[PDB]
Amino acid sequence: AQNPNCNIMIFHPTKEEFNDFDKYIAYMESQGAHRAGLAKIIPPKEWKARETYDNISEILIATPLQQVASGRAGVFTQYHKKKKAMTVGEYRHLANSKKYQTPPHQNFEDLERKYWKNRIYNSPIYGADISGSLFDENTKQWNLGHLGTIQDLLEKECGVVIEGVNTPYLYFGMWKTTFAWHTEDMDLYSINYLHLGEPKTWYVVPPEHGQRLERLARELFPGSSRGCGAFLRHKVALISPTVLKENGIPFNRITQEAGEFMVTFPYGYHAGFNHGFNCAEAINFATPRWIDYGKMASQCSCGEARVTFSMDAFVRILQPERYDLWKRGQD
Numbered sequence: 474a475q476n477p478n479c480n481i482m483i484f485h486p487t488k489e490e491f492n493d494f495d496k497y498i499a500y501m502e503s504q505g506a507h508r509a510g511l512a513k514i515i516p517p518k519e520w521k522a523r524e525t526y527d528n529i530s531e532i533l534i535a536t537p538l539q540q541v542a543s544g545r546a547g548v549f550t551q552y553h554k555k556k557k558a559m560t561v562g563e564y565r566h567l568a569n570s571k572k573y574q575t576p577p578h579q580n581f582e583d584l585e586r587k588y589w590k591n592r593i594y595n596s597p598i599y600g601a602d603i604s605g606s607l608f609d610e611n612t613k614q615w616n617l618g619h620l621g622t623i624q625d626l627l628e629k630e631c632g633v634v635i636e637g638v639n640t641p642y643l644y645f646g647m648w649k650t651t652f653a654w655h656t657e658d659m660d661l662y663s664i665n666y667l668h669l670g671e672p673k674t675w676y677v678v679p680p681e682h683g684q685r686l687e688r689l690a691r692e693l694f695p696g697s698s699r700g701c702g703a704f705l706r707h708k709v710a711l712i713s714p715t716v717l718k719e720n721g722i723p724f725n726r727i728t729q730e731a732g733e734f735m736v737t738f739p740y741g742y743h744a745g746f747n748h749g750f751n752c753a754e755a756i757n758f759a760t761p762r763w764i765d766y767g768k769m770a771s772q773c774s775c776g777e778a779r780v781t782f783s784m785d786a787f788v789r790i791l792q793p794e795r796y797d798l799w800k801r802g803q804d
């Protein structure tokens with residue numbers, strides 16, 4: 474079996490290899506990439522997402538989120554406090570202000586140390602889940618707004634026709650902005666392109682060991698666990714690499730830089746943080762191998778998770794037994 478230690482693999486496709494998205498994902502899996510839960514793809518040197526980013530300051534962040542932490546440095550939750558709208562230009566200026574800017578540091582490791590030591594004592598502001606794309610329409614390869622849809626994948630694989638659409642989201646980050654431990658909706662894949670700015674550090678648990686993380690999470694967040702059988706779906710819980718190591722949870726880490734893609738694989742739990750002002754674009758996608766994960770995916774039914782319109786059909790077709798109870802949580 475390929476990649477038995479479940480290491481994060483890094484790929485360097487040629488421009489020829491970069492033409493067929495599905496084929497390259499299948500290739501990465503043939504090499505065992507999915508066992509890690511996360512892979513990095515460095516685009517060929519000839520490729521560009523768009524000409525320049527010189528005209529993006531006018532994008533609106535309608536609902537910036539202030540990420541307020543509770544708990545201890547290595548085990549905490551964060552809640553999202555809504556702030557007044559601001560443009561990306563305003564947000565960038567805020568990110569670079571003395572209050573929010575990345576501190577002096579020696580390297581990525583020093584910055585990682587500072588993040589886990591000090592994150593809880595600050596409340597950075599994130600522009601997350603903004604529907605849109607920064608890929609040029611003329612970019613034909615790995616354009617996250619031009620991928621085959623999850624609905625079409627389900628139809629091709631299962632012969633079922635369903636409602637729903639599947640579009641990308643933009644994420645504007647600053648120092649300490651954080652993504653909590655989670656898998657994707659329906660345990661889908663995700664693909665994430667870092668368009669511009671400072672890096673993003675990722676942590677990931679191999680899909681074959683996801684239940685180990687869940688067990689630890691139930692121990693570390695006991696109230697949350699009692700409230701919901703799938704509380705990680707709430708996307709609010711953080712556990713540091715030190716605490717993971719102390720508890721023997723298998724995981725890996727890697728830092729994504731501007732111009733690089735990351736792919737998360739079905740049921741690959743991931744979390745991470747931004748180093749400074751940046752902009753990423755991400756979307757969920759599916760392959761034939763996903764279908765069985767979609768059938769088995771946990772669901773939040775306590776009402777906290779609250780997911781997109783399009784998830785309805787996924788649950789309805791792949792998890793009909795769960796559908797009634799799950800939908801009671803949406804209404």
Ligand SMILES: O=C(O)c1ccccc1C(=O)O
Pocket residue numbers: 687688690691702703704705706771772
């Ligand atoms: O439902 C699960 O398998 C689960 C179990 C323990 C913690 C969290 C979850 C979750 O899905 O978020």
Ligand SMILES: Nc1[nH]c(N)c2ccccc12
Pocket residue numbers: 543544545548549550693694695696697698
């Ligand atoms: N609010 C809340 N619930 C659980 N389980 C927590 C653990 C740590 C910090 C806050 C928490």
Ligand SMILES: O=C(O)CNC(=O)C(=O)O
Pocket residue numbers: 644651652663664665737753755756
């Ligand atoms: O970039 C972020 O803030 C969060 N991204 C993801 O969880 C993802 O691409 O799957």
Ligand code: NI
Pocket residue numbers: 655656657663737743
């Ligand atoms: Ni994700």
Ligand SMILES: [Zn+2]
Pocket residue numbers: 700701702703704706707773774775776777778
């Ligand atoms: Zn819930």
